[PDB]
Design a protein around this ligand. Sequence first.
Ligand code: HEM
Ligand code: HEM
Lengths: 161, 162, 524, 524
Amino acid sequence: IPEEISIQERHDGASREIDRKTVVANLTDAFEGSTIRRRKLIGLSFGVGMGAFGLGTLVAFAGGLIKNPWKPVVPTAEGKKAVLWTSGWTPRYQGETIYLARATGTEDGPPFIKMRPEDMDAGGMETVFPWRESDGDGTTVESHHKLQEIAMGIRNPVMLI
Amino acid sequence: DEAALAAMSNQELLALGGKLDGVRIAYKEPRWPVEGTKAEKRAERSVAVWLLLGGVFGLALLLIFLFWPWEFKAADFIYSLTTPLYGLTFGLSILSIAIGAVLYQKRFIPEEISIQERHDGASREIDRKTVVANLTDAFEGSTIRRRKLIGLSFGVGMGAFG
Amino acid sequence: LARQAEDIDTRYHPSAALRRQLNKVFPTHWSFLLGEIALYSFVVLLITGVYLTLFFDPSMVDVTYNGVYQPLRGVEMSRAYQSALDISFEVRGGLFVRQIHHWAALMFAAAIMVHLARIFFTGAFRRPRETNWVIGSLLLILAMFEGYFGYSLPDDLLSGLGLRAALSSITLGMPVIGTWLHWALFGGDFPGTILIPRLYALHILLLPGIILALIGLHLALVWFQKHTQFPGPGRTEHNVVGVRVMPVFAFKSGAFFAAIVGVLGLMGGLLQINPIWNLGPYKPSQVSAGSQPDFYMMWTEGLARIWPPWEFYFWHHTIPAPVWVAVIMGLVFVLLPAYPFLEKRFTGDYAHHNLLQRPRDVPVRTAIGAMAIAFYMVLTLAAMNDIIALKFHISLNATTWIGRIGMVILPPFVYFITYRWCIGLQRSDRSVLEHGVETGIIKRLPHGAYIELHQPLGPVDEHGHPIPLQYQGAPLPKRMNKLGSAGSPGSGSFLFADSAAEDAALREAGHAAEQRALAALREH
Amino acid sequence: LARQAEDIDTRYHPSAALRRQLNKVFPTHWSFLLGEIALYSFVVLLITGVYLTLFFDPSMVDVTYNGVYQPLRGVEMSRAYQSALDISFEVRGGLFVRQIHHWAALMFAAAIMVHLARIFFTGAFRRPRETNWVIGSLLLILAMFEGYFGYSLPDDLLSGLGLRAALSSITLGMPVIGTWLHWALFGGDFPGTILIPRLYALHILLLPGIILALIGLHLALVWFQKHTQFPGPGRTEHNVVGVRVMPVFAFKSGAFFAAIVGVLGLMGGLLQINPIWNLGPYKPSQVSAGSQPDFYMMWTEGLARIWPPWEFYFWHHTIPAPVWVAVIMGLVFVLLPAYPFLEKRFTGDYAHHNLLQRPRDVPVRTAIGAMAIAFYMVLTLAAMNDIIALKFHISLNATTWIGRIGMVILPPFVYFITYRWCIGLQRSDRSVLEHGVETGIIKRLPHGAYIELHQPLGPVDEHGHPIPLQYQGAPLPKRMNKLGSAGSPGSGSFLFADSAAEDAALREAGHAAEQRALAALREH
Ligand code: HEM
Ligand code: HEM
């Protein structure tokens, strides 16, 4: 392909004065032909209506995401508390027995099994989860779903060293 | 078309600009040639009524959206009114705004008639000749017209890759 | 502010382009707003859809509801249906927004159909703008398919049945490819774990983007190639009559957009539509009279219903009836963009035109349009068989046979009728052009005769008979009160009259303005 | 073909504007292609993302794998991870395509960073193009956020941990609003059933569309406002030197696009990236040293790591440490578009400029750029502390302290060093301007001296010492071989020479052509 060199002649900078004058005159005539400059009430009403409609529309649009992080939804032993104040270890009827069940990783066997003090070592690290014996083993659909729910909890896991 | 264009009337400046853009305007007349009359005041009151109605309906929409019982309890006479009331308020508000705008345009904005002067049809011959010459020199300068092997290889490679 | 304008002009120096675009003139006519209606509907669809995407979950894994709607508690169901019920009942106002979305989509379909019909009637599809017509046809087809994909995402049993029937039957019925296409689309058998996510992605990503880009292309083409105009006094094949953009045209467009948003909101909030909660989750073993999907693809269902059962059997193979339905719909697809070339080759006309033709001047094209619209209407109403036989006590078989004979015997009748109709309209226009406007006043003529007292529209002969004019395609006032007939009442508003001087001055100003306008238009 | 061109001309009448744009001249320099690479990478991301959407399923309902990967059979897992595994292993070449997508995203990030650096160095951000700089800052921020959302859809341990830490801690740590934003985003607690679908929708629909529209706007602005150019022999503030479009510009762009696609494909096929199958499904109880997310937001992680633990406790309230990190990142966001205003109100310069400045000419701006780049590099390398201590046996605490102290002590050192470096470069340029460029040849001078034998670059005085020239901001050769002294060896290809006449003719033709080009450029 042959090589070439060319010059563009930018013609940059401010526009030609005639075009500016024509545009300014056209805009000024269009704006002042409406005679809205001498109607304060009409402009005020238009502004108030536009503002009210805009605020209402945006509030309605944004209303689908607002939730209260402080409403009592989780039942407890002292009434109902917000999610952020609970971690799944709170007793529910004032005297529940919760075992520090450890994970197993097997499907046929229960996902969690009870823990004995003798089954530890001088430098053993283990992971435990709340059991809540009324849950039951993973046989029925409800029990399996409850076990999965207790498994998926951010503030649930606890170390025992 | 001269530096003496300063101190020039707005209407004639607009006409000159239209001439540069090829648009001639006829019958540009104000909607109220007569001086201030009670008819114009009645018209402005009427157009303001629609805007006030739109604002009031928007405020009512905000109030109902903030303070309405919308949780399901049907098993009430009120839960069956959330969506209808929302739609009613929204439509009334913006429809009042629209009708106010159209009435203001119709009874206040002056009418006009203009001509465009299409300049349709085929382009000017000089432009066609210049474009044809540019394209021909660009293609002929490539010299590929006398290279069958290069073009064939390029086509085969492009087809195989595609 | 002057400072900002000066800075912008010094920086970007946009003067000529702004002046060139701002001084453009648009034709003024009520029929010319039937595209902005569809574009505003499209804007509403996009805004609602971009809102709804924040509360959906397209999954086919079976789950339990245990939500708020008590009658549906403890029923295994699709996750997507659960998300749809959530946005319909649990989120404040979600039902309103989704109903607005659906109603706006229906408005979009109706508006595009009406706009296409108007364009076909006006005959602007000639040589200068045929590519625009092809683009419009492709837009219609893609919009129709995307809308068909619309009501299927909340996979209730009704939408599930519709998509099952259509896709599974037609795709598997292909004579040659057949099973390959269906297995590619669904990933195996008909009920697939990937069908809903694929449909969701296709409905939100590819088709809307292609549609928006092609709409932009269509608008650019109509922007560059100047719009046509109806014949009139100051109208000619080398100029355009209308209004400038800045003072009027944009303001009217904004007002119209606000008005359509208002009517959409009002009617969407007033009318319930697609109550999925009343329905149930889709299962293969549940079926009922719930049928007749959305009305803008309804012709395919009607054609499937009406077709006679013809089948062919050769060596270990079988081609079912619906293949004919596929052939017919493909032929309808092909014919829509091929019409301009067919007409050009049939009539042998290769001339440029910037002036449209009124509907009563071209009998053949109007007859073909009546042909097509009658065929579409009879196809649409044929598949309303269940509702028609239910509301009105009519036999289902009887209505089916009525349709079966109608789509073949009705078309020629309306074709001939509309041909005669156009000829009669042309004859009436010629008769109006011959004599004066019928004033509806009769005189006794003491010698004993009754006359009509025609009002001539122009020059008359020495004997008082109007000099005949020449037809030019311009509309004429059929009623006397349309033209002249000075009868404007007093200057009051509703209860109190104004000053006589004010009324006289206003009457003089109005008469002078109208006379000056008509004189300027006629002289130009 | 002639007929098609004639029809096109007769229909749309485009010749003038087409001739206008087709005759546009673009500047020629290697540094001017660092945006085309980013645009081509963006095209690659778009096409791959269009492909990937046909096999994904964003659902958080727990399922079982029971697929083909034996070491992962029978494990409770999220649906999206199963779909990702399906795309990686059970589709012919899907892993290749997703690897191409990820590598292309990294390509895009690196390209945009390099392009921004080159723009900042050249100083084209002055008055004529400030809005372009603001748009570029917005593009960088939006692209960085989109890239952050990218690697999070296949919710493995790495992505889950990263999103959990960043989003949960930062959003919940907001002093005033805090929990409201987190609950709005996640719909309640952190692990939500709607989080992943929302992220998927935001990654496919909103951000890509906004990015594409803004990229088109930036390209249009750089198209209208003519590109700058380096100072040179035939260059001035009222003209542009380069090549036309048709024979060179588009062809080079296409070749570069093909080459970038080639390097992306090669390096994607060679290098494994993000092996999610080696990872596991996300659970709150699994965690390890897996950290340090994608390298274009790694600075936020480093800032979180190095920040000292300062906290404030007043009446039943507590503001944690990461709020300072949020303040720092917000200020970094704010400063990026506000730099040109600060410079123009600090130096008091309000003049237009179409010619750039070479980096060694302006010491202060280069020093500030070195400041910023050194800060970014030291912050980025701090977050990679674990790999530093692992591959190289170094104390973790020692490396953390080194990063902490260096964030304060290193910046001034490099600032001063680069200031001295720029001053020295200016001094060297002045010195090479004063005398002839060194030829590297010495002479014995029988009387007993040694001379450099400078080669003058222009006019020479009566004494043989070239008269001083003037600096014009133009680069000058520093080596003899840069200028034509002795080159162009024999006309053979690799083993056999050609005829002497042909070689001589080629040599003289090349010399004549180069001399003619230089004379034409210098005179004009
Ligand atoms: C452009 C033309 C479009 C048409 C004709 C259309 C049509 C429809 C229809 C009829 C439904 C059924 C609604 C229902 O049964 O309640 C639907 C659902 C849905 N569409 Fe569209 N839509 C369009 C654009 C979009 C866009 C732009 C988005 C997202 C950006 C979107 C996302 C959705 C979603 C998330 C749903 C589920 C909500 C629901 O079913 O109620 N659609 N669509
Ligand atoms: C705007 C620039 C984009 C960025 C920064 C981005 C970022 C990412 C990243 C980092 C990944 C992970 C790749 C991998 O794991 O192999 C990804 C995957 C993906 N992206 Fe994008 N993406 C972008 C554009 C798009 C577009 C336009 C689409 C299509 C609408 C898309 C859809 C996807 C899909 C479906 C995946 C799944 C593939 C996978 O993760 O393996 N992305 N994206």
